[PDB]
Amino acid sequence: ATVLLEVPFSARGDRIPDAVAELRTREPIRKVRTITGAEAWLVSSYALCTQVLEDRRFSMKETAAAGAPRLNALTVPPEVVNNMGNIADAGLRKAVMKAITPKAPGLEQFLRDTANSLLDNLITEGAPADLRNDFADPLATALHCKVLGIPQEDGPKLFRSLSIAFMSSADPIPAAKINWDRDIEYMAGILENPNITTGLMGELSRLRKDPAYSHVSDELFATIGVTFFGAGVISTGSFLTTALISLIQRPQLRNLLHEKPELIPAGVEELLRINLSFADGLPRLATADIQVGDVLVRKGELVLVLLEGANFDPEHFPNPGSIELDRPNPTSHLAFGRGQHFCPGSALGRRHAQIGIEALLKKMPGVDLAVPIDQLVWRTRFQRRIPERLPVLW
Numbered sequence: 295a296t297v298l299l300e301v302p303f304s305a306r307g308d309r310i311p312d313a314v315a316e317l318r319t320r321e322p323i324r325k326v327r328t329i330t331g332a333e334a335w336l337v338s339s340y341a342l343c344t345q346v347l348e349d350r351r352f353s354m355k356e357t358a359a360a361g362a363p364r365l366n367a368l369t370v371p372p373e374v375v376n377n378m379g380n381i382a383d384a385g386l387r388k389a390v391m392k393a394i395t396p397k398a399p400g401l402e403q404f405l406r407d408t409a410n411s412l413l414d415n416l417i418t419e420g421a422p423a424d425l426r427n428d429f430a431d432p433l434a435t436a437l438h439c440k441v442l443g444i445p446q447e448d449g450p451k452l453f454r455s456l457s458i459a460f461m462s463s464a465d466p467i468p469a470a471k472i473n474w475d476r477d478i479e480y481m482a483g484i485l486e487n488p489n490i491t492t493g494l495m496g497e498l499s500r501l502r503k504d505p506a507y508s509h510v511s512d513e514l515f516a517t518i519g520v521t522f523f524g525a526g527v528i529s530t531g532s533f534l535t536t537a538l539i540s541l542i543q544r545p546q547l548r549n550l551l552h553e554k555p556e557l558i559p560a561g562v563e564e565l566l567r568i569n570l571s572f573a574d575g576l577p578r579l580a581t582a583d584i585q586v587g588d589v590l591v592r593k594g595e596l597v598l599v600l601l602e603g604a605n606f607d608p609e610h611f612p613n614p615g616s617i618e619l620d621r622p623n624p625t626s627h628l629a630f631g632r633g634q635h636f637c638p639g640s641a642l643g644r645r646h647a648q649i650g651i652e653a654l655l656k657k658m659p660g661v662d663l664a665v666p667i668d669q670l671v672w673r674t675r676f677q678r679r680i681p682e683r684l685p686v687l688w
């Protein structure tokens with residue numbers, strides 16, 4: 295006798311388990327056990343992943359319900375699981391989304407300058423360099439302080455909540471609440487700080503005093519700041535880090551992108567497609583009995599949408615494990631999700647990675663791992679897959 299198949303399969307972000315292709319072929323929706331002991335349906339084909347994400351009866355909001363089967367413990371208050379809905383209900387969605395594009399004057403220049411400064415510091419210090427802690431994550435942090443309009447010097451302390459805030463734990467995490475409450479207090483203070491006039495927090499600070507938002511809560515305004523900083527920094531820093539591994543492990547592609555940087559957007563789209571950054575399937579709770587492939591999912595059951603299941607599905611992306619810069623369907627991957635909860639930061643995330651890679655290839659055309667790939671230490675019980683350090687030479 296064996297136990298019910300457990301998720302997640304592996305914390306390694308440099309290879310897809312061959313179990314994924316076997317599930318997808320044999321049982322593209324199948325029962326699994328999560329770290330909490332709950333049962334869930336793991337969905338691993340492109341067709342069924344899309345079906346689930348495009349049907350809101352598979353609800354994000356309802357995953358926060360008391361007594362539901364859980365992927366992991368909440369690290370935020372339950373109402374905050376519905377953060378985007380709350381933003382939309384407050385009339386703030388258009389303005390929030392506008393503030394977090396890469397489009398503001400000087401933003402791309404700021405990203406390039408920041409990337410180049412970080413790289414110059416690494417070059418001065420000499421190999422080996424840690425491209426996570428000393429490149430990708432500081433670039434993400436700097437970007438999000440700029441996008442939010444908050445002081446650069448405040449970035450590190452906000453950042454240091456993230457190794458706990460984005461845990462994927464069986465149980466509630468006391469430190470997550472300590473840091474959440476502190477970070478909310480910080481953002482509340484930002485909203486009252488007259489120096490903060492630019493970026494997302496500058497905009498929210500004005501809207502907060504406008505009559506059309508007089509009944510929007512102070513708590514929601516502060517929550518937007520904490521949630522968008524955290525989601526954006528963890529997602530961009532982690533994606534860029536693991537994308538850099540994928541790139542470095544493909545010297546021929548590294549060389550091609552170096553030689554023809556106009557190909558970097560197409561390269562980043564493929565790096566998004568093959569990314570293993572999300573450590574768990576995206577969770578949804580069924581609000582009705584719904585047929586998904588061969589399974590009738592019952593009301594109240596948990597469904598996990600495995601992004602690499604979809605993105606490595608050969609029925610949608612032939613030769614799925616290969617980076618091919620001339621695919622006919624390049625942006626149709628699920629790296630940013632799909633449907634109601636599609637990532638509002640997608641354009642910014644693309645730009646962060648494109649500029650980071652452009653800068654790195656120009657400054658370090660010979661970039662290579664400085665340790666055997668198996669020596670990377672993969673963070674466990676976390677909502678992202680990332681190496682603790684990424685040692686490189688050039």
Ligand code: HEM
Nearest residue numbers: 378525526529530533576629630631635637638639642643
């Ligand atoms: C390459 C970088 C990024 C990746 C791969 C990524 C991926 C995703 C995914 C897969 C989802 C959907 C989650 C779901 O449906 O359960 C999502 C949602 C979200 N992302 Fe991103 N993201 C990235 C960057 C960003 C940035 C830069 C921000 C903000 C500045 C951001 C903010 C959000 C927020 C707030 C949501 C929740 C939307 C909702 O609940 O409707 N993300 N992201």
